[PDB]
Each structure stands twice: as C-alpha cells, then as structure tokens.
Amino acid sequence: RIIGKAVYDEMTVDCHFTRAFYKRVLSIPVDLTDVEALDPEFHRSLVWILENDIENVLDMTFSIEQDRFGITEIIDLKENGRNIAVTNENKREYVELVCRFKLVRVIERQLSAFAEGFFEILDVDMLKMFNEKELELLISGLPEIDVDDWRNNTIYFGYTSDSQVIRWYWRAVRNFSMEERAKLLQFATGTSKLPLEGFAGLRCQNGNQKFQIHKASGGSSRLPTAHTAFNQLDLPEYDSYEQLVKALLFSLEE
C-alpha cells in the first residue's frame, strides 16, 4: 500500500528489491539467472543438467528432499512429483520448477501480501506494461548516472582502460540514454541504486566492490555475461564498436 501509493502520487521510494521480487510482482516467472546471485553452485549444477545429455547418468527423481531438522519432508513439484523421473524432455520443466521452489517457495506468502496491497492501489493491467527492470525505475526513480564517475571507479581483468574493447564499451555507455545506462547498471549489479559517493563506494553482497569488467573468453558472437554477486561484467572480445554496442543492448534488455 505504501509503495503503491508512492507510485500513484509520483513519489520515489528508496525501496530497491531483488529481481525475483520485481518479477513476482509483475507475475513473471523466476529464471536460473535469479538463482546465480544467491547460490552459484546450485546455478552451476543446474546449468550442466540443462546443457548436457544427462538422461543416462541421472538416477534422480523429480521430487526434492527438504530436511525439516528431525525428519526430511519430501516435496512434490507437481501432481505425483515423487514418482515422476527426470528426463532430457523434462529437463526444462524440472530446472524451471526447482528455481521456483528454491526461492519463490520461501518468499511466496510474503510476495502475495505485498502484491495484494500494491495492486489494491495501482491497476494490475496498467503496471503490467513495465519490465522487471522498469518497475524498479518506476518505484525508485530513474538515476542520471555519471559515465565519468563509472569509468573512474571501474576495474579491469584481461583488459586495460585503453583496451580497444574497453574504449568501445565506454563510447557505447556514453552514447546510451539515461534509461539504457540504468538498465546496464541493473544488469551487471542487479540494482539501479547507486551510493551517494557514486561508483567509488559501490558495494555487492560480498562487501564493497568497484564495477569489474573481465575478458569473457568468448568469440565476437558470444554475449556479455553478468555476475551480480561482485558487480562483474564479462565482456567478450568484440571485433567492432557496432558489434559490441548491439550485443550490450541485447544483454541489458532480454
């Protein structure tokens, strides 16, 4: 009701939430990207499962063992989920269901209450026109983000401030609109929130972390991968400015 009334009254609030929170308010399902920040080995185990032909060496049921300290309570993901086996066909189903039962199950009742009070102020159909990223900008505001401050407090790995790939990256960020710059910040960090000092006192979940850009070890075809846990953006070696600027724009959008 507060955040809903704040938006209704064209008032910005310092309420920055997780991407999974913004997705659930908009009734958008949680994908594996939301799991990466929270548990990277849970994310790394699922990626191998979804990429490789695990059908032969699976030996795993569709149900999951959640230990209730004294005794473990087996949870079904669907009707008769404990008897259903995991296959190459059901690999998308199991992975998308386990993402919703790892975070959305212990954050469902909290979110359902928020959405009830939020949508009892704002029209569900009106607010739905905003992206999971644009909802943060609607609620909190659109930051006018200083590219000079961003470049002054950005550290590189595999590159230097003068690397051609980097020089194109900064040229692209300078050219980006204030909207695109904010979507690039929330892509690599997970939030539009910027400290008052700026990118200098930037912080991640694991303490403080100045924005880090790494050589992604991918060809000019591959896309920029982000690791919100350390404000990290893995930029592969592009061959032209127009190639990098289009692959940057695709990543932040999606």
Side-chain angles (χ1 to χ4, degrees), residues 139-173:
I139 285 168
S140 326
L142 178 75
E144 299 284 300
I145 166 162
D146 195 21
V147 193
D148 283 274
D149 183 64
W150 199 342
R151 88 161 265 151
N152 297 338
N153 311 92
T154 293
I155 73 176
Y156 315 98
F157 287 89
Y159 303 138
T160 68
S161 57
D162 196 54
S163 269
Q164 183 64 258
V165 188
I166 293 301
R167 277 183 284 112
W168 284 332
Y169 169 82
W170 290 122
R171 179 185 158 180
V173 180

PDB file of all heavy atoms in Angstrom, residues 139-173:
ATOM      1  N   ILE A 139       9.218   2.776  -9.401  1.00  0.00           N
ATOM      2  CA  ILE A 139       9.117   2.820  -7.941  1.00  0.00           C
ATOM      3  C   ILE A 139      10.131   3.761  -7.276  1.00  0.00           C
ATOM      4  O   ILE A 139       9.766   4.602  -6.449  1.00  0.00           O
ATOM      5  CB  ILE A 139       9.238   1.350  -7.434  1.00  0.00           C
ATOM      6  CG1 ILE A 139       7.948   0.569  -7.693  1.00  0.00           C
ATOM      7  CG2 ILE A 139       9.680   1.248  -5.975  1.00  0.00           C
ATOM      8  CD1 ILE A 139       8.070  -0.880  -7.507  1.00  0.00           C
ATOM      9  N   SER A 140      11.404   3.611  -7.649  1.00  0.00           N
ATOM     10  CA  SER A 140      12.519   4.309  -7.033  1.00  0.00           C
ATOM     11  C   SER A 140      12.984   5.555  -7.775  1.00  0.00           C
ATOM     12  O   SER A 140      13.577   6.426  -7.153  1.00  0.00           O
ATOM     13  CB  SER A 140      13.685   3.342  -6.824  1.00  0.00           C
ATOM     14  OG  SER A 140      13.290   2.006  -6.529  1.00  0.00           O
ATOM     15  N   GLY A 141      12.742   5.615  -9.082  1.00  0.00           N
ATOM     16  CA  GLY A 141      13.161   6.723  -9.941  1.00  0.00           C
ATOM     17  C   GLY A 141      14.193   6.322 -10.983  1.00  0.00           C
ATOM     18  O   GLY A 141      14.743   5.220 -10.909  1.00  0.00           O
ATOM     19  N   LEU A 142      14.460   7.195 -11.981  1.00  0.00           N
ATOM     20  CA  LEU A 142      15.491   6.904 -12.988  1.00  0.00           C
ATOM     21  C   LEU A 142      16.772   7.708 -12.696  1.00  0.00           C
ATOM     22  O   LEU A 142      16.790   8.921 -12.928  1.00  0.00           O
ATOM     23  CB  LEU A 142      15.021   7.210 -14.406  1.00  0.00           C
ATOM     24  CG  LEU A 142      16.081   6.972 -15.483  1.00  0.00           C
ATOM     25  CD1 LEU A 142      16.264   5.512 -15.750  1.00  0.00           C
ATOM     26  CD2 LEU A 142      15.759   7.717 -16.732  1.00  0.00           C
ATOM     27  N   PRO A 143      17.863   7.052 -12.252  1.00  0.00           N
ATOM     28  CA  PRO A 143      19.078   7.805 -11.948  1.00  0.00           C
ATOM     29  C   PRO A 143      19.810   8.359 -13.162  1.00  0.00           C
ATOM     30  O   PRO A 143      19.977   7.670 -14.177  1.00  0.00           O
ATOM     31  CB  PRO A 143      19.938   6.785 -11.201  1.00  0.00           C
ATOM     32  CG  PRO A 143      19.482   5.468 -11.711  1.00  0.00           C
ATOM     33  CD  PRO A 143      18.016   5.622 -11.921  1.00  0.00           C
ATOM     34  N   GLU A 144      20.259   9.625 -13.042  1.00  0.00           N
ATOM     35  CA  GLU A 144      21.089  10.292 -14.049  1.00  0.00           C
ATOM     36  C   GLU A 144      22.522   9.889 -13.645  1.00  0.00           C
ATOM     37  O   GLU A 144      23.122  10.436 -12.706  1.00  0.00           O
ATOM     38  CB  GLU A 144      20.867  11.818 -14.056  1.00  0.00           C
ATOM     39  CG  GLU A 144      19.431  12.223 -14.380  1.00  0.00           C
ATOM     40  CD  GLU A 144      19.012  12.122 -15.840  1.00  0.00           C
ATOM     41  OE1 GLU A 144      19.647  12.802 -16.680  1.00  0.00           O
ATOM     42  OE2 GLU A 144      18.044  11.386 -16.145  1.00  0.00           O
ATOM     43  N   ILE A 145      22.996   8.821 -14.280  1.00  0.00           N
ATOM     44  CA  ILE A 145      24.213   8.076 -13.961  1.00  0.00           C
ATOM     45  C   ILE A 145      25.476   8.582 -14.733  1.00  0.00           C
ATOM     46  O   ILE A 145      25.565   8.453 -15.946  1.00  0.00           O
ATOM     47  CB  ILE A 145      23.878   6.553 -14.140  1.00  0.00           C
ATOM     48  CG1 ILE A 145      25.111   5.673 -14.176  1.00  0.00           C
ATOM     49  CG2 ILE A 145      22.941   6.230 -15.340  1.00  0.00           C
ATOM     50  CD1 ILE A 145      24.705   4.250 -13.899  1.00  0.00           C
ATOM     51  N   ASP A 146      26.443   9.185 -13.983  1.00  0.00           N
ATOM     52  CA  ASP A 146      27.695   9.795 -14.477  1.00  0.00           C
ATOM     53  C   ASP A 146      28.680   8.776 -15.025  1.00  0.00           C
ATOM     54  O   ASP A 146      29.312   8.061 -14.238  1.00  0.00           O
ATOM     55  CB  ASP A 146      28.381  10.594 -13.354  1.00  0.00           C
ATOM     56  CG  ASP A 146      29.460  11.541 -13.841  1.00  0.00           C
ATOM     57  OD1 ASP A 146      29.443  11.896 -15.048  1.00  0.00           O
ATOM     58  OD2 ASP A 146      30.320  11.933 -13.019  1.00  0.00           O
ATOM     59  N   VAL A 147      28.844   8.740 -16.365  1.00  0.00           N
ATOM     60  CA  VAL A 147      29.747   7.784 -17.013  1.00  0.00           C
ATOM     61  C   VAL A 147      31.208   8.013 -16.628  1.00  0.00           C
ATOM     62  O   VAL A 147      31.973   7.060 -16.547  1.00  0.00           O
ATOM     63  CB  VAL A 147      29.567   7.706 -18.544  1.00  0.00           C
ATOM     64  CG1 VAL A 147      30.285   6.489 -19.105  1.00  0.00           C
ATOM     65  CG2 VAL A 147      28.104   7.653 -18.913  1.00  0.00           C
ATOM     66  N   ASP A 148      31.584   9.265 -16.361  1.00  0.00           N
ATOM     67  CA  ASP A 148      32.943   9.593 -15.965  1.00  0.00           C
ATOM     68  C   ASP A 148      33.250   8.987 -14.603  1.00  0.00           C
ATOM     69  O   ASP A 148      34.296   8.380 -14.421  1.00  0.00           O
ATOM     70  CB  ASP A 148      33.155  11.110 -15.987  1.00  0.00           C
ATOM     71  CG  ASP A 148      33.343  11.648 -17.395  1.00  0.00           C
ATOM     72  OD1 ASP A 148      34.495  11.640 -17.891  1.00  0.00           O
ATOM     73  OD2 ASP A 148      32.338  12.039 -18.015  1.00  0.00           O
ATOM     74  N   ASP A 149      32.308   9.088 -13.671  1.00  0.00           N
ATOM     75  CA  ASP A 149      32.436   8.502 -12.334  1.00  0.00           C
ATOM     76  C   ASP A 149      32.454   6.973 -12.419  1.00  0.00           C
ATOM     77  O   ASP A 149      33.141   6.322 -11.632  1.00  0.00           O
ATOM     78  CB  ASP A 149      31.261   8.965 -11.455  1.00  0.00           C
ATOM     79  CG  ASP A 149      31.315   8.474 -10.023  1.00  0.00           C
ATOM     80  OD1 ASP A 149      32.260   8.862  -9.290  1.00  0.00           O
ATOM     81  OD2 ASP A 149      30.399   7.735  -9.624  1.00  0.00           O
ATOM     82  N   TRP A 150      31.689   6.410 -13.375  1.00  0.00           N
ATOM     83  CA  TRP A 150      31.606   4.989 -13.637  1.00  0.00           C
ATOM     84  C   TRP A 150      32.956   4.487 -14.139  1.00  0.00           C
ATOM     85  O   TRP A 150      33.451   3.479 -13.638  1.00  0.00           O
ATOM     86  CB  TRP A 150      30.504   4.722 -14.672  1.00  0.00           C
ATOM     87  CG  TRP A 150      29.983   3.315 -14.735  1.00  0.00           C
ATOM     88  CD1 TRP A 150      30.574   2.190 -14.242  1.00  0.00           C
ATOM     89  CD2 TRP A 150      28.788   2.880 -15.401  1.00  0.00           C
ATOM     90  NE1 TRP A 150      29.813   1.086 -14.544  1.00  0.00           N
ATOM     91  CE2 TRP A 150      28.711   1.482 -15.253  1.00  0.00           C
ATOM     92  CE3 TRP A 150      27.742   3.542 -16.050  1.00  0.00           C
ATOM     93  CZ2 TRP A 150      27.625   0.744 -15.714  1.00  0.00           C
ATOM     94  CZ3 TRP A 150      26.685   2.802 -16.538  1.00  0.00           C
ATOM     95  CH2 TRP A 150      26.627   1.422 -16.358  1.00  0.00           C
ATOM     96  N   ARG A 151      33.571   5.191 -15.112  1.00  0.00           N
ATOM     97  CA  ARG A 151      34.858   4.767 -15.661  1.00  0.00           C
ATOM     98  C   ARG A 151      35.992   4.994 -14.685  1.00  0.00           C
ATOM     99  O   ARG A 151      36.932   4.200 -14.674  1.00  0.00           O
ATOM    100  CB  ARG A 151      35.154   5.363 -17.058  1.00  0.00           C
ATOM    101  CG  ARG A 151      35.840   6.725 -17.082  1.00  0.00           C
ATOM    102  CD  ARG A 151      36.476   6.987 -18.432  1.00  0.00           C
ATOM    103  NE  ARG A 151      37.894   6.621 -18.456  1.00  0.00           N
ATOM    104  CZ  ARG A 151      38.550   6.220 -19.545  1.00  0.00           C
ATOM    105  NH1 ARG A 151      37.912   6.100 -20.712  1.00  0.00           N
ATOM    106  NH2 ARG A 151      39.839   5.913 -19.474  1.00  0.00           N
ATOM    107  N   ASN A 152      35.900   6.032 -13.843  1.00  0.00           N
ATOM    108  CA  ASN A 152      36.948   6.297 -12.870  1.00  0.00           C
ATOM    109  C   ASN A 152      37.012   5.242 -11.766  1.00  0.00           C
ATOM    110  O   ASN A 152      38.064   5.069 -11.140  1.00  0.00           O
ATOM    111  CB  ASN A 152      36.803   7.687 -12.277  1.00  0.00           C
ATOM    112  CG  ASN A 152      36.943   8.786 -13.291  1.00  0.00           C
ATOM    113  OD1 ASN A 152      37.524   8.623 -14.366  1.00  0.00           O
ATOM    114  ND2 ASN A 152      36.383   9.930 -12.979  1.00  0.00           N
ATOM    115  N   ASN A 153      35.895   4.543 -11.511  1.00  0.00           N
ATOM    116  CA  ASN A 153      35.851   3.544 -10.456  1.00  0.00           C
ATOM    117  C   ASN A 153      35.403   2.184 -10.980  1.00  0.00           C
ATOM    118  O   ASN A 153      34.586   1.507 -10.343  1.00  0.00           O
ATOM    119  CB  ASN A 153      34.992   4.029  -9.290  1.00  0.00           C
ATOM    120  CG  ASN A 153      35.342   5.433  -8.829  1.00  0.00           C
ATOM    121  OD1 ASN A 153      34.759   6.425  -9.285  1.00  0.00           O
ATOM    122  ND2 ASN A 153      36.305   5.551  -7.920  1.00  0.00           N
ATOM    123  N   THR A 154      35.946   1.805 -12.156  1.00  0.00           N
ATOM    124  CA  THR A 154      35.724   0.526 -12.820  1.00  0.00           C
ATOM    125  C   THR A 154      37.067  -0.148 -12.935  1.00  0.00           C
ATOM    126  O   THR A 154      37.982   0.444 -13.493  1.00  0.00           O
ATOM    127  CB  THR A 154      35.189   0.740 -14.233  1.00  0.00           C
ATOM    128  OG1 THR A 154      33.882   1.291 -14.159  1.00  0.00           O
ATOM    129  CG2 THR A 154      35.122  -0.539 -15.023  1.00  0.00           C
ATOM    130  N   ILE A 155      37.209  -1.376 -12.428  1.00  0.00           N
ATOM    131  CA  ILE A 155      38.479  -2.114 -12.527  1.00  0.00           C
ATOM    132  C   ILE A 155      38.409  -3.156 -13.671  1.00  0.00           C
ATOM    133  O   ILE A 155      37.316  -3.638 -13.990  1.00  0.00           O
ATOM    134  CB  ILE A 155      38.885  -2.718 -11.167  1.00  0.00           C
ATOM    135  CG1 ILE A 155      38.010  -3.918 -10.791  1.00  0.00           C
ATOM    136  CG2 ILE A 155      38.844  -1.650 -10.083  1.00  0.00           C
ATOM    137  CD1 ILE A 155      38.396  -4.620  -9.510  1.00  0.00           C
ATOM    138  N   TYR A 156      39.541  -3.449 -14.337  1.00  0.00           N
ATOM    139  CA  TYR A 156      39.520  -4.380 -15.473  1.00  0.00           C
ATOM    140  C   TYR A 156      40.355  -5.620 -15.226  1.00  0.00           C
ATOM    141  O   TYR A 156      41.316  -5.577 -14.459  1.00  0.00           O
ATOM    142  CB  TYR A 156      39.962  -3.698 -16.789  1.00  0.00           C
ATOM    143  CG  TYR A 156      39.338  -2.339 -17.006  1.00  0.00           C
ATOM    144  CD1 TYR A 156      40.030  -1.179 -16.695  1.00  0.00           C
ATOM    145  CD2 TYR A 156      38.034  -2.216 -17.459  1.00  0.00           C
ATOM    146  CE1 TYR A 156      39.437   0.071 -16.821  1.00  0.00           C
ATOM    147  CE2 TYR A 156      37.442  -0.969 -17.622  1.00  0.00           C
ATOM    148  CZ  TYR A 156      38.142   0.173 -17.284  1.00  0.00           C
ATOM    149  OH  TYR A 156      37.564   1.409 -17.406  1.00  0.00           O
ATOM    150  N   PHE A 157      39.986  -6.729 -15.890  1.00  0.00           N
ATOM    151  CA  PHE A 157      40.677  -8.021 -15.841  1.00  0.00           C
ATOM    152  C   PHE A 157      40.747  -8.556 -17.261  1.00  0.00           C
ATOM    153  O   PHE A 157      39.717  -8.702 -17.917  1.00  0.00           O
ATOM    154  CB  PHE A 157      39.924  -9.008 -14.958  1.00  0.00           C
ATOM    155  CG  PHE A 157      40.053  -8.702 -13.493  1.00  0.00           C
ATOM    156  CD1 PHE A 157      39.158  -7.854 -12.864  1.00  0.00           C
ATOM    157  CD2 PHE A 157      41.083  -9.245 -12.747  1.00  0.00           C
ATOM    158  CE1 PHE A 157      39.278  -7.569 -11.517  1.00  0.00           C
ATOM    159  CE2 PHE A 157      41.206  -8.956 -11.396  1.00  0.00           C
ATOM    160  CZ  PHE A 157      40.300  -8.124 -10.788  1.00  0.00           C
ATOM    161  N   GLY A 158      41.956  -8.798 -17.743  1.00  0.00           N
ATOM    162  CA  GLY A 158      42.143  -9.211 -19.128  1.00  0.00           C
ATOM    163  C   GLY A 158      42.231  -8.022 -20.076  1.00  0.00           C
ATOM    164  O   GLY A 158      42.730  -8.157 -21.198  1.00  0.00           O
ATOM    165  N   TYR A 159      41.757  -6.838 -19.623  1.00  0.00           N
ATOM    166  CA  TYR A 159      41.771  -5.572 -20.345  1.00  0.00           C
ATOM    167  C   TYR A 159      42.434  -4.452 -19.505  1.00  0.00           C
ATOM    168  O   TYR A 159      42.752  -4.635 -18.332  1.00  0.00           O
ATOM    169  CB  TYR A 159      40.340  -5.132 -20.663  1.00  0.00           C
ATOM    170  CG  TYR A 159      39.511  -6.104 -21.457  1.00  0.00           C
ATOM    171  CD1 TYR A 159      38.185  -6.343 -21.129  1.00  0.00           C
ATOM    172  CD2 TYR A 159      40.010  -6.694 -22.608  1.00  0.00           C
ATOM    173  CE1 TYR A 159      37.388  -7.177 -21.902  1.00  0.00           C
ATOM    174  CE2 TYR A 159      39.228  -7.542 -23.382  1.00  0.00           C
ATOM    175  CZ  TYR A 159      37.916  -7.781 -23.023  1.00  0.00           C
ATOM    176  OH  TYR A 159      37.128  -8.622 -23.762  1.00  0.00           O
ATOM    177  N   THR A 160      42.639  -3.289 -20.136  1.00  0.00           N
ATOM    178  CA  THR A 160      43.140  -2.051 -19.545  1.00  0.00           C
ATOM    179  C   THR A 160      42.151  -0.924 -19.927  1.00  0.00           C
ATOM    180  O   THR A 160      41.348  -1.096 -20.852  1.00  0.00           O
ATOM    181  CB  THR A 160      44.549  -1.733 -20.066  1.00  0.00           C
ATOM    182  OG1 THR A 160      44.491  -1.409 -21.456  1.00  0.00           O
ATOM    183  CG2 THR A 160      45.519  -2.869 -19.847  1.00  0.00           C
ATOM    184  N   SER A 161      42.236   0.245 -19.270  1.00  0.00           N
ATOM    185  CA  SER A 161      41.373   1.381 -19.615  1.00  0.00           C
ATOM    186  C   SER A 161      41.473   1.777 -21.096  1.00  0.00           C
ATOM    187  O   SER A 161      40.518   2.338 -21.648  1.00  0.00           O
ATOM    188  CB  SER A 161      41.689   2.580 -18.726  1.00  0.00           C
ATOM    189  OG  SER A 161      43.053   2.961 -18.811  1.00  0.00           O
ATOM    190  N   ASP A 162      42.623   1.437 -21.732  1.00  0.00           N
ATOM    191  CA  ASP A 162      42.955   1.706 -23.124  1.00  0.00           C
ATOM    192  C   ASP A 162      42.764   0.503 -24.067  1.00  0.00           C
ATOM    193  O   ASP A 162      43.094   0.603 -25.249  1.00  0.00           O
ATOM    194  CB  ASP A 162      44.387   2.219 -23.238  1.00  0.00           C
ATOM    195  CG  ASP A 162      44.665   2.874 -24.565  1.00  0.00           C
ATOM    196  OD1 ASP A 162      43.909   3.805 -24.932  1.00  0.00           O
ATOM    197  OD2 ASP A 162      45.623   2.437 -25.255  1.00  0.00           O
ATOM    198  N   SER A 163      42.214  -0.625 -23.581  1.00  0.00           N
ATOM    199  CA  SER A 163      41.942  -1.779 -24.446  1.00  0.00           C
ATOM    200  C   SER A 163      40.871  -1.363 -25.458  1.00  0.00           C
ATOM    201  O   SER A 163      39.907  -0.721 -25.054  1.00  0.00           O
ATOM    202  CB  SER A 163      41.428  -2.949 -23.617  1.00  0.00           C
ATOM    203  OG  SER A 163      42.505  -3.762 -23.196  1.00  0.00           O
ATOM    204  N   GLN A 164      41.040  -1.672 -26.755  1.00  0.00           N
ATOM    205  CA  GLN A 164      40.068  -1.264 -27.782  1.00  0.00           C
ATOM    206  C   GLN A 164      38.639  -1.681 -27.467  1.00  0.00           C
ATOM    207  O   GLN A 164      37.710  -0.891 -27.641  1.00  0.00           O
ATOM    208  CB  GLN A 164      40.495  -1.755 -29.168  1.00  0.00           C
ATOM    209  CG  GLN A 164      39.572  -1.306 -30.291  1.00  0.00           C
ATOM    210  CD  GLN A 164      39.543   0.194 -30.470  1.00  0.00           C
ATOM    211  OE1 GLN A 164      38.598   0.880 -30.047  1.00  0.00           O
ATOM    212  NE2 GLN A 164      40.583   0.741 -31.104  1.00  0.00           N
ATOM    213  N   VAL A 165      38.483  -2.889 -26.910  1.00  0.00           N
ATOM    214  CA  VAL A 165      37.195  -3.436 -26.479  1.00  0.00           C
ATOM    215  C   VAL A 165      36.573  -2.503 -25.429  1.00  0.00           C
ATOM    216  O   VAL A 165      35.399  -2.165 -25.539  1.00  0.00           O
ATOM    217  CB  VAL A 165      37.354  -4.871 -25.903  1.00  0.00           C
ATOM    218  CG1 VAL A 165      35.993  -5.516 -25.647  1.00  0.00           C
ATOM    219  CG2 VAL A 165      38.221  -5.751 -26.807  1.00  0.00           C
ATOM    220  N   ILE A 166      37.392  -2.054 -24.444  1.00  0.00           N
ATOM    221  CA  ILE A 166      37.028  -1.154 -23.343  1.00  0.00           C
ATOM    222  C   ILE A 166      36.710   0.243 -23.841  1.00  0.00           C
ATOM    223  O   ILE A 166      35.700   0.821 -23.434  1.00  0.00           O
ATOM    224  CB  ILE A 166      38.127  -1.146 -22.256  1.00  0.00           C
ATOM    225  CG1 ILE A 166      38.201  -2.505 -21.565  1.00  0.00           C
ATOM    226  CG2 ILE A 166      37.913  -0.033 -21.238  1.00  0.00           C
ATOM    227  CD1 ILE A 166      36.924  -2.938 -20.891  1.00  0.00           C
ATOM    228  N   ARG A 167      37.538   0.768 -24.749  1.00  0.00           N
ATOM    229  CA  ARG A 167      37.315   2.083 -25.332  1.00  0.00           C
ATOM    230  C   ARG A 167      36.007   2.141 -26.095  1.00  0.00           C
ATOM    231  O   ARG A 167      35.341   3.171 -26.057  1.00  0.00           O
ATOM    232  CB  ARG A 167      38.506   2.522 -26.181  1.00  0.00           C
ATOM    233  CG  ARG A 167      39.608   3.125 -25.322  1.00  0.00           C
ATOM    234  CD  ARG A 167      40.771   3.643 -26.138  1.00  0.00           C
ATOM    235  NE  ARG A 167      41.626   2.564 -26.637  1.00  0.00           N
ATOM    236  CZ  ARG A 167      41.738   2.222 -27.915  1.00  0.00           C
ATOM    237  NH1 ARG A 167      41.044   2.866 -28.846  1.00  0.00           N
ATOM    238  NH2 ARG A 167      42.554   1.238 -28.277  1.00  0.00           N
ATOM    239  N   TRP A 168      35.603   1.021 -26.735  1.00  0.00           N
ATOM    240  CA  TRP A 168      34.307   0.922 -27.415  1.00  0.00           C
ATOM    241  C   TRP A 168      33.193   0.815 -26.393  1.00  0.00           C
ATOM    242  O   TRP A 168      32.147   1.407 -26.598  1.00  0.00           O
ATOM    243  CB  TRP A 168      34.239  -0.296 -28.350  1.00  0.00           C
ATOM    244  CG  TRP A 168      34.989  -0.145 -29.635  1.00  0.00           C
ATOM    245  CD1 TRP A 168      35.253   1.012 -30.310  1.00  0.00           C
ATOM    246  CD2 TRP A 168      35.547  -1.204 -30.417  1.00  0.00           C
ATOM    247  NE1 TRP A 168      35.957   0.737 -31.459  1.00  0.00           N
ATOM    248  CE2 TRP A 168      36.153  -0.617 -31.547  1.00  0.00           C
ATOM    249  CE3 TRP A 168      35.615  -2.593 -30.261  1.00  0.00           C
ATOM    250  CZ2 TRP A 168      36.799  -1.374 -32.520  1.00  0.00           C
ATOM    251  CZ3 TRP A 168      36.259  -3.338 -31.225  1.00  0.00           C
ATOM    252  CH2 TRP A 168      36.868  -2.727 -32.322  1.00  0.00           C
ATOM    253  N   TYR A 169      33.416   0.054 -25.301  1.00  0.00           N
ATOM    254  CA  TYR A 169      32.460  -0.134 -24.215  1.00  0.00           C
ATOM    255  C   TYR A 169      32.087   1.209 -23.612  1.00  0.00           C
ATOM    256  O   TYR A 169      30.902   1.485 -23.436  1.00  0.00           O
ATOM    257  CB  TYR A 169      32.999  -1.099 -23.135  1.00  0.00           C
ATOM    258  CG  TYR A 169      32.161  -1.113 -21.874  1.00  0.00           C
ATOM    259  CD1 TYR A 169      31.001  -1.869 -21.793  1.00  0.00           C
ATOM    260  CD2 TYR A 169      32.487  -0.306 -20.792  1.00  0.00           C
ATOM    261  CE1 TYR A 169      30.210  -1.858 -20.649  1.00  0.00           C
ATOM    262  CE2 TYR A 169      31.688  -0.263 -19.656  1.00  0.00           C
ATOM    263  CZ  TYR A 169      30.558  -1.054 -19.578  1.00  0.00           C
ATOM    264  OH  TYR A 169      29.785  -1.023 -18.442  1.00  0.00           O
ATOM    265  N   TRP A 170      33.090   2.045 -23.305  1.00  0.00           N
ATOM    266  CA  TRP A 170      32.819   3.352 -22.726  1.00  0.00           C
ATOM    267  C   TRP A 170      32.163   4.296 -23.699  1.00  0.00           C
ATOM    268  O   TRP A 170      31.290   5.052 -23.293  1.00  0.00           O
ATOM    269  CB  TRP A 170      34.067   3.963 -22.087  1.00  0.00           C
ATOM    270  CG  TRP A 170      34.478   3.253 -20.833  1.00  0.00           C
ATOM    271  CD1 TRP A 170      35.678   2.654 -20.582  1.00  0.00           C
ATOM    272  CD2 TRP A 170      33.668   3.038 -19.666  1.00  0.00           C
ATOM    273  NE1 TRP A 170      35.670   2.091 -19.328  1.00  0.00           N
ATOM    274  CE2 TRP A 170      34.444   2.305 -18.749  1.00  0.00           C
ATOM    275  CE3 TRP A 170      32.349   3.370 -19.326  1.00  0.00           C
ATOM    276  CZ2 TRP A 170      33.939   1.889 -17.521  1.00  0.00           C
ATOM    277  CZ3 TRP A 170      31.866   2.985 -18.099  1.00  0.00           C
ATOM    278  CH2 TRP A 170      32.654   2.248 -17.213  1.00  0.00           C
ATOM    279  N   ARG A 171      32.519   4.205 -24.997  1.00  0.00           N
ATOM    280  CA  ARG A 171      31.911   5.011 -26.048  1.00  0.00           C
ATOM    281  C   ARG A 171      30.423   4.650 -26.135  1.00  0.00           C
ATOM    282  O   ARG A 171      29.577   5.543 -26.138  1.00  0.00           O
ATOM    283  CB  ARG A 171      32.611   4.755 -27.381  1.00  0.00           C
ATOM    284  CG  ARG A 171      32.011   5.555 -28.514  1.00  0.00           C
ATOM    285  CD  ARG A 171      32.627   5.192 -29.844  1.00  0.00           C
ATOM    286  NE  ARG A 171      31.739   5.557 -30.949  1.00  0.00           N
ATOM    287  CZ  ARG A 171      32.019   5.356 -32.231  1.00  0.00           C
ATOM    288  NH1 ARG A 171      33.168   4.790 -32.588  1.00  0.00           N
ATOM    289  NH2 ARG A 171      31.156   5.721 -33.170  1.00  0.00           N
ATOM    290  N   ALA A 172      30.109   3.337 -26.101  1.00  0.00           N
ATOM    291  CA  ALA A 172      28.753   2.821 -26.121  1.00  0.00           C
ATOM    292  C   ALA A 172      27.997   3.333 -24.899  1.00  0.00           C
ATOM    293  O   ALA A 172      26.958   3.944 -25.093  1.00  0.00           O
ATOM    294  CB  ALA A 172      28.768   1.299 -26.155  1.00  0.00           C
ATOM    295  N   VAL A 173      28.561   3.214 -23.665  1.00  0.00           N
ATOM    296  CA  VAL A 173      27.908   3.705 -22.443  1.00  0.00           C
ATOM    297  C   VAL A 173      27.677   5.221 -22.501  1.00  0.00           C
ATOM    298  O   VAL A 173      26.604   5.675 -22.099  1.00  0.00           O
ATOM    299  CB  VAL A 173      28.599   3.263 -21.125  1.00  0.00           C
ATOM    300  CG1 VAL A 173      27.873   3.815 -19.912  1.00  0.00           C
ATOM    301  CG2 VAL A 173      28.665   1.755 -21.028  1.00  0.00           C
TER     302      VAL A 173
END
